Amino acid sequence: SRRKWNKTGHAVRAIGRLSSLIANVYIMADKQKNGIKANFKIRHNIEDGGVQLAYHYQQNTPIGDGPVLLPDNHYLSTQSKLSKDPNEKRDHMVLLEFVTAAGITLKGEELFTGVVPILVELDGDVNGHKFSVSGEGEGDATYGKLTLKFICTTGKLPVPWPTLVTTLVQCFSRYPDHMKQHDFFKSAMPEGYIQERTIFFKDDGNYKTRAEVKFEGDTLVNRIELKGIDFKEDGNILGHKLEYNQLTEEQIAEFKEAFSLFDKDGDGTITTKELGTVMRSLGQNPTEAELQDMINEVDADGNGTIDFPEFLTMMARSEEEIREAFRVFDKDGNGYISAAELRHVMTNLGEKLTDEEVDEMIREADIDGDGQVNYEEFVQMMT
């Protein structure tokens, strides 16, 4: 009996474990409307345990008359991080999001090659409670990245912030090279698109939304109207019973800097060619098969290259990792990292620093004043 509970417990948990690993945004063409439709589920964590489901139905149509790209079926994958600004007294949300497209094997776009300013404006009415939200920040589609801050401009927000995240610019998603012809969102720009949703909160009310997303000069603007009906006074939404919120923003900034040493052409992905070049410049000799297998281990989407969200996952997932790192730096294996050896590694990686900056790095690590870094000093610096 204790064995039967184990066997059937494992199976039921396997299914849970399989299901909670996914919340993709499934996109399909809508030819008759010269646009797309999407559907997906969001699971909002309830503060003291449990999940509140939010079922999303989406349609998008172009605003302008020029041709747009209508895709084959595919999906977006997202990771969101919510935080608070310690200096802000107004009701507010700070948001960092990474989004990439996947699901397919093997002029608007030029508007998105660099960092683009974003404005967001929402006017809402949930069960009669009128409120407004204003948001500003920037998007960098090279990295599938959004960073934004939102304020409630009418006082206290009558709903939880996490319930507004999906409503509050999919044109900033990263489409990999093999899927460029499937990016409706950027194809619609600069004239833009209309995006409409219905969002059903299980056992509670629904939101209906309509938004215009378009360029106004060089700023990508998302202007939205939202109406919520049939919400329960003491449900998870009007009762504020959902969790609000991981690495820090500055920890993520460090990993971007590291990622740039491999991504030498700045296209947002590390190929086998780029990884091999960095490995060989440090004295190592992987085969092409090994490079492919290395990438394949962290390759979310099977396109054969490592983008920034992939790289992040990997570096957020040891004593022995640090010993091997030491060996890479200690070229002649005598037990000490010399300023010459450090300068060499920096050059090999592509980092440009003066001899003075390299000595400053030695100084930061050099506890015993011999002007070299030993293994224990290196550990202290790595931890």
Pairing state of beta strands 116-126 and 219-229? parallel
| Out of 368, 376, 380, 382, the residue judged to bind Ca ion by CB under 5 A | 368
Say if residue 376 carries a ligand binding annotation: no
In degrees and rounded to multiples of 5, residue 359 shows phi and psi of -65, -35
Per CB under 8 A, does 334 bind a second copy? no
CB of 55 to a second copy, least distance (A): 12
Report which of 345, 341, 176, 177 is spatially closest to residue 261, judged by C-alpha positions.
345
Report which of 180, 182, 157 is spatially closest to residue 168, judged by C-alpha positions.
157
Decide whether 364 or 376 has the Cβ nearer to a second copy: 364
**Alpha-carbon distance values, 174 to 110, 183, 321, 331 (Å):** 13, 9, 31, 39
Residues 254-283 that bind a second copy (CB under 8 A): 254-255, 257-258, 261-262, 275, 278-279, 282
In degrees and rounded to multiples of 5, residue 265 shows phi and psi of -85, 5
Q: What is the DSSP code string of 82-122?
A: EE--TT--SSEEEEEEEEEEE-S---GGGGGSS-EEEEEEE
Q: Which stretch binds a second copy (CB under 8 A): 130-138, 151-159, 201-209, 309-317?
A: 309-317
CB of 67 to a second copy, least distance (A): 27
| Out of 88, 249, 360, 370, the residue judged to bind Ca ion by CB under 5 A | 370
Report which of 268, 253, 284 is spatially closest to residue 349, judged by C-alpha positions.
284
Residues 307-366 that bind Ca ion (CB under 5 A): 330, 332, 334, 336, 366
Give kind and range of the element (H or E) at residue 322. Answer: helix 319-329
Per CB under 8 A, does 352 bind a second copy? no
Per CB under 8 A, does 332 bind a second copy? no
- Structural contact between residues 331 and 338, judged by C-beta atoms closer than 8 angstroms: no
Per CB under 5 A, does 301 bind Ca ion? yes
- Known binding-site positions for Ca(2+): 263, 265, 267, 269, 274, 299, 301, 303, 305, 310, 330, 332, 334, 336, 341, 366, 368, 370, 372, 377
Q: Which residues bind Ca ion (CB under 5 A)?
A: 263, 265, 267, 299, 301, 303, 330, 332, 334, 336, 366, 368, 370
